[PDB]
Design a protein around this ligand. Structure first.
Ligand SMILES: Cc1ccc(O[C@@H](CCCCOc2ccc(Cl)cc2)C(=O)O)cc1
Length: 133
């Protein structure tokens, strides 16, 4: 029942500062423009210990499955090859991606009827808000 309140189908309804986050990450111009336009559907499900998070959009359909605390290899939507570890900290899913001596952290939290996604790369934060689909 560890992630019950995350499970479901969610749709992006707002984004703030995502271009700057993507610049900080190293995303190039064309990908920033097209990916920044995307309005993804996030689908979260749990089966036993395995959590699956799908992101479906006009830009790319991606999917990760993982066990909390157990590192995995992830190809991101911008084609970074990263090592990822996702944990639960105080009811917040904390997703750290490592690559090329760099790190970014993505936090996902339930707040009221929303799922809030906070993306941090050094001093830059982007906040993306999802609501139930
Ligand atoms: C097509 C797409 C565009 C933006 C996305 O935002 C991520 C927020 C979490 C960031 C994950 O890693 C990145 C970093 C940069 C880009 Cl351009 C896409 C994903 C989200 O909303 O789940 C997802 C998908």
């Amino acid at each position: 029942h560890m992630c019950d309140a995350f499970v479901g189908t969610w749709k992006l309804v707002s984004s703030e500062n995502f271009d700057d986050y993507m610049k900080e990450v190293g995303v190039g111009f064309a990908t920033r423009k097209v990916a920044g336009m995307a309005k993804p559907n996030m689908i979260i499900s749990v089966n036993g210990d395995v959590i699956t998070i799908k992101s479906e959009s006009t830009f790319k359909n991606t999917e990760i499955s993982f066990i909390l605390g157990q590192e995995f290899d992830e190809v991101t939507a911008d084609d970074r090859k990263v090592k990822s570890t996702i944990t639960l900290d105080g009811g917040v899913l904390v997703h750290v991606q490592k690559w090329d001596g760099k790190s970014t952290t993505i936090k996902r939290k339930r707040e009221d009827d929303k799922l809030v996604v906070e993306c941090v790369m050094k001093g830059v934060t982007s906040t993306r808000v999802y609501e139930r689909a």
